[model samples]
Target: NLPARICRDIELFHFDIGPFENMWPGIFVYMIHRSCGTSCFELEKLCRFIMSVKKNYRRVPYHNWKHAVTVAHCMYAILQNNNGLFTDLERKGLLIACLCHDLDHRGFSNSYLQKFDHPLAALYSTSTMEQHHFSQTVSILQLEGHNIFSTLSSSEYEQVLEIIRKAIIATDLALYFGNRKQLEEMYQTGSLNLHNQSHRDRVIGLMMTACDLCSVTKLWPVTKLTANDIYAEFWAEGDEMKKLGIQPIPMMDRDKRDEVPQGQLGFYNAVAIPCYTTLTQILPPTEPLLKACRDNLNQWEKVIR
Candidate 1:
């Protein structure tokens, strides 16, 4: 009875569906089953895996389970019109990566971790948090009954994990800038070839970025709710940095709240706009995402004015 409702609830795959926090696990299972089909997966193990992924995330204000589910939902929205663009393995990996990308996030930035001389910072020379997120994802997969990919053969398992690894790691904004540059080049020259594996890989990275920042493209009310949470998380991190005698970035500093409109404007213009713009070029069906981002950008402009 409950399963049927979840199936219907996730059918549209848009932000208008609102944040269904309570039904996220069921929605995740539904998406996984849809991607894998009955022939390739076991439902019971998938349920266990989703629950484990949920448990792994910290209760941070932003990078919590809610954000994970929303990112996965954005991936689901894109996959609906994949148009033979991605293989089944790629599709599954993208969804899983979106759901697990920020696992165990400390609500702190990579620079903050390095400044604190944290252990994870010591372990990874670059992209520390992203590497940790990918590592944590693998750890969960190793746990018994948590291997959602158990039905796959050895080679397929490794391939999927590689895709998930790339997808998760690409969520780091540092890598995203490079990924967007490559995608933007393709967009400029009109040379995107879906048949080419190299091009597809870049597109996967771009898609991960798009989904990660999908909140910026939401409707006003949803954007307000999510933006507040993000700032709350940022301010919390800022509070920590202050205690450690390190200064927080303006966006993270609660005292600089008055500058949020300008900060958001810069983010939308520089990061979010070009991202959705490039993505929509390759996948026209995703135009709504780009348009919604523009709408929010306009709102930010009005706030600044």
Candidate 2:
């Protein structure tokens, strides 16, 4: 029999790499029931849209279908744990955003794309892949029978797309630093309200980033494999940089494999820890994310030591 799960349960679903044909929509169904109240009838149309979105994911090392669904799984986990902190519309919009965030990526960073004058870079001129992804996401949403939101009121549709746009684009790690600080001040000032549209606008972005980088906080072997997949993609870009007589970033250099631990240590400390710590402060149920990330940081420190 074909299997739908890899690691067996929701807590460990991040480790699975199965094709799970409708795994993407299965996730949608799970979220719709738990978050939105969309019925089984709507699930059918949603599955059609899911197929199109899933097929659009390129076969890249780290940004492939596996990454997309895994990120969705992470979103599922977050909402499952903290549903009370997010609205139904926010929940529905975010669940779909994670599934299609990396659609059509060519496995290269924004700098690499811009350096090579890649068409997507020319088109976006900033946040290249992210803008392209959102464009592509809406493109598919335009397809006949694929507009899962077609049944929605025009106003609701607009609101859903806006959430999708911001949430999907926020997956860009380039925005992570600025967004982190902006959000930090919110939680610090104790003014971040999940109910306010303006407040949720900022939070959905941060939440999607957390879901996008969820691998950093994953259990070992999952975390380690993510690094390998990430570096594999980075090394390919490095190869292209070398061909142009240009140097890649230290972490992207294949020769800097020795620097993996230090790089991971820096990222876990400066990025992952703060993101989750502040998140947990706002939403206590998310503490598991912080715990796993801190645990991984300890493992990384061992190598750096």
Candidate 3:
């Protein structure tokens, strides 16, 4: 049984929800139950599916189970605080997409996979890892004890799957970088109509990116520690590249760790700040995220100087 404390903490805005991978299945079960209720989903299937999803995530320093849990919690927090913004189906798809977005991440990026001639690269011409992630989510669901969406009709099941697929792919920063300006213009021009499916999906995509990068919008202590984990993973990939006689980028090279502050500064200004800023415009309740992101930007600036 999930603890009451955990259930309550999952809804908190700025709390440091650490690497509680052991309790992740229970946490996911709770969120699904709260959102869809037991009548709409089988408890045993839900538990098993969540466990499989967690297992699929590689034991990398970052982008592992812990990262998935945090992202899902961020989605849960967003859904709870900003009611009526999304339909029930969108809410379910977003939460599941957050949980499964980074599944099977091997501490390497799409470029790494492409350059290394990984099989996934051949299978998917673009968004290599993301396509694999969505496929993995599907693979787990097909397992006998893991069909969490069994209660849904065929049409609804396919709809949620498409939502999950789109949201998962949007988490890829390569896609996000190109699409964010369009998202910003939607809000700027007041044309973000939820009644329109494409417009709604665009917003969901934005929210997915925001939640994926939510760590930077956390409190100082949490953000600092999460950054360490992210760089550790980056450096691991760098080590791999070095072994293969490839020169790693300065951001990935451990020897250039001194430049981390500057790299983070660029990231915050170009990605994190704009993400949360526009997100806040769409959902005012997310203002705290934008506030924390700016605060962390200040922290990084101080570190650089």
- Model 3 CA lDDT for position 138: 92
Per-residue lDDT tens digits of candidate 2, residues 80-155? 7774677677778887898889989889899998888888887899889999999999999999889888877899
In model 3, what lDDT does residue 203 have? 79
Q: Estimate each model's TM-score.
A: 0.94, 0.92, 0.95
Clashing residue pairs in candidate 3, if any? none
Each candidate's lDDT (Cα)?
A: 0.85, 0.80, 0.86
The list of candidate 3 runs beyond 4 A from truth reads 1-7
lDDT of 2 at 269: 79
Q: Model 1: what TM-score? A: 0.94
Whole-model lDDT, model 3: 0.86
User: For residues 114-225, what per-residue lDDT tens digits would candidate 3 score against the true structure?
Assistant: 8788999999989999999999999988988788778789999999999999999999899887678887888889888878888777778888998899999788999998
By lDDT rank, best first, the candidates go: 3, 1, 2
For candidate 1, the per-residue lDDT at 114 reads 91
Tens digits of per-residue lDDT for model 1, 64-183: 998898899889888876647778888888888999999999899998899899999989979999999999999999998889888789999999999999898889888888888888
Clashes of each: 0, 0, 0
Candidate 1's displacement at residue 143, Å, is 0.9
